[PDB]
Structure 1
Amino acid sequence: GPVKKWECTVESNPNVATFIKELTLRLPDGESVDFRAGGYVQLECPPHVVEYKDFDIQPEYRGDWDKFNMWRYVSKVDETVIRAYSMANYPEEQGVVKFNIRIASPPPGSDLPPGQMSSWVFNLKPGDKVTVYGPFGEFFAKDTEAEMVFIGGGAGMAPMRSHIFDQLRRLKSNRKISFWYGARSLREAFYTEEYDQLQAENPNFQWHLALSDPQPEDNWTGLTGFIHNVLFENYLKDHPAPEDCEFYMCGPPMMNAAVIKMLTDLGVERENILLDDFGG
């Protein structure tokens, strides 16, 4: 049916990684968005000016905001903008829409304008008003009993969380499900306690974190490198029938491309790979 519209209030907007915030919007009037896991809404901003030095960035992330010279950026937006963001909540988490949003700052060294909507999102404080439109979606789980392999990176965590909670807690599914998330270091990993608990509670579910640049403080002895190599070496290379799995992918462009190439090379048919392309 026609697009619905809600004037929401910001409940919380902390960083969950150095360059990713978890934005939670409370819907008005006790309403909920009738969305499906993997779906999205559009957020809108009015004309504005935002200065990055005004952002609230939690303490452990600030050193890299200094290193990346982020505090000098200013974004001037002369007209209303709309952008899609994927729900990180699943449908049984009512009354809110929750997001994982990467700050799309200018490439280091360039003179390009900062990202219009994400810069505005990073200055949202509890109590601010945000207009939301939707729901929309196409990145939906197939209705089968096949093994599921979820692959995520960056703010692609949002539909990954939605999908995984939907399978395990709403559908109470017993399908074989794994989740593979690539990040730079432990400070860039989030929802780790949630996934560890879901693995403890659901013997059909397993997750894996691979770090590309583990930091000394991480004392990391787990998987390292790029997620497409990790998933191949530690699981798919020896899998009896990878072509029988359903793959659900959402990451930054380079990750999407590398994972899809790895899978197609293994003989997985493109029909068995569902991609949520954020268009980065």
Structure 2
Amino acid sequence: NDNPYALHRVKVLKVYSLTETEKLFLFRFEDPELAEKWTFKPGQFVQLTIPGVGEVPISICSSPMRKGFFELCIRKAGRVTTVVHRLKPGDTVLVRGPYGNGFPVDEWEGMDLLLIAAGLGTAPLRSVFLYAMDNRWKYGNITFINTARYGKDLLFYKELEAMKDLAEAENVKIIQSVTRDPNWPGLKGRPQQFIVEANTNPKNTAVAICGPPRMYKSVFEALINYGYRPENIFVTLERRMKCGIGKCGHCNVGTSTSWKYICKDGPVFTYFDIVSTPGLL
């Protein structure tokens, strides 16, 4: 009840082998009372718990309107993830409630959105893209840029290419480009090379970025060079987390002047927060 570390039971509905090193899972809580009331903001993460192994955070990549269901794109890079990869549909896992503050979609209405995803961080941006598509009336033209580096690692490439015609019909420019695949029959170039061709009007554009922070400096410079508003830039950064309620102490960012904690002051940050305290990147 009042225990903050408490969990809830959830069963995997369907497993979807996304790529070689990533896998997509579908979840629904066993308790109907939790299923009918559970909700989240796009950008909030979930403390997935394998019984007897450990707890790991995975960002929700589903539409919040679909109550009782959510998807978690997990890559096998370690112990808990390796155990997770062996989980079959119709198996049990303990999941904790949503944590952190999602992307500021409530403040966003009507303005153009530049959703630029790099590498693994596509999942929160996939969630905000699905949220925007589910309420397409209250948003302008949106550009979703998802990039990778090995060609085959374009997450949800089939889903985006299937919706490409409808996206072009609905004033949506979804762009997928590779960084280190000259032989791949597609788009070559960094995400900065493709945000110059953005349909969004810089005067009234909100920008959401996710992925590796080493390209954050380059994308910030490219966005600010084109006149995009620095007051409407938001990013996501990851650190070690074991609690999600602000008591673990592992996810500490910033300096003494501003010592933010990601589980309570994020994981969706602001541009002036990023440039204000060095070491966030």
What TM-score, normalized by structure 1, do the two folds share?
A: 0.71
Deviation string 1:191-226 (CA, Å, 9 cap, x unpaired) is: 23433454533523210000123375x4x1x32122
- Aligned letter for 2:84? V
**Which residue number corresponds to residue 271 of structure 1?**
231
| Greater RCO structure (CA 8 Å; 6+ sep) | 1
Deviation string 1:25-72 (CA, Å, 9 cap, x unpaired) is: 221134153112222211123444xxxxxxxxxxxxxxxxxxxxxxxx
2-side partners of 1:137 and 1:171: how far apart?
Answer: 25
Instruction: Give yes or no for contact 1:27–1:97 (8 Å, CA) kept in 2.
Output: no
**Which residue number corresponds to residue 249 of structure 1?**
209
SS of match in other structure, 1:139: coil
2-side partners of 1:257 and 1:122: how far apart?
Answer: 33
- Aligned letter for 1:211? V
SS of match in other structure, 1:253: coil
Comparing both structures, which one devotes a greater share of its residues to helix? Answer: 1
Instruction: Give yes or no for contact 1:20–1:155 (8 Å, CA) kept in 2.
Output: no
**Which residue number corresponds to residue 111 of structure 2?**
146
1-side partners of 2:221 and 2:87: how far apart?
Answer: 38
Q: Which is further off, 23-32 or 84-93?
A: 23-32
1-side partners of 2:135 and 2:217: how far apart?
Answer: 31
| Equivalent position to 1:225, from 184, 189, 193 | 189
2-side partners of 1:229 and 1:42: how far apart?
Answer: 36
Consecutive unaligned residues of structure 1, counting only runs of 5 or more, are 49-80, 105-114
Taking structure 1 as reference, are residues 23 and 278 closer, same or farther at Cα in structure 2, changes over 3 Å only? farther
Taking structure 1 as reference, are residues 261 and 19 closer, same or farther at Cα in structure 2, changes over 3 Å only? farther
| Equivalent position to 1:262, from 216, 222, 247 | 222
TM-fit CA distance, 1:89: 1.0
| 1:180-195 equivalent positions in 2, closer than 5 A | 180-195=145-160
SS of match in other structure, 1:194: helix
Taking structure 1 as reference, are residues 102 and 262 closer, same or farther at Cα in structure 2, changes over 3 Å only? farther
* 2:152 counterpart of 1:161: no
| 1:107-126 equivalent positions in 2, closer than 5 A | 115-126=78-89
SS of match in other structure, 2:144: strand
**Which residue number corresponds to residue 20 of structure 2?**
18
Deviation string 1:129-177 (CA, Å, 9 cap, x unpaired) is: 1111112242322323221100112332211221111111245434111
| Equivalent position to 2:72, from 99, 124, 139 | 99
Q: Percent identity?
A: 25
What TM-score, normalized by structure 2, do the two folds share?
A: 0.70
* 2:48 counterpart of 1:43: yes
**Which residue number corresponds to residue 254 of structure 2?**
none
1-side partners of 2:31 and 2:41: how far apart?
Answer: 21
**Which residue number corresponds to residue 34 of structure 1?**
39
Q: Would you say how many aligned residue pairs link Structure 1 and Structure 2?
A: 231
| Equivalent position to 2:174, from 207, 217, 220 | 207
* 2:83 counterpart of 1:136: no
Taking structure 1 as reference, are residues 102 and 185 closer, same or farther at Cα in structure 2, changes over 3 Å only? same
Consecutive unaligned residues of structure 2, counting only runs of 5 or more, are 241-281
Taking structure 1 as reference, are residues 93 and 150 closer, same or farther at Cα in structure 2, changes over 3 Å only? same
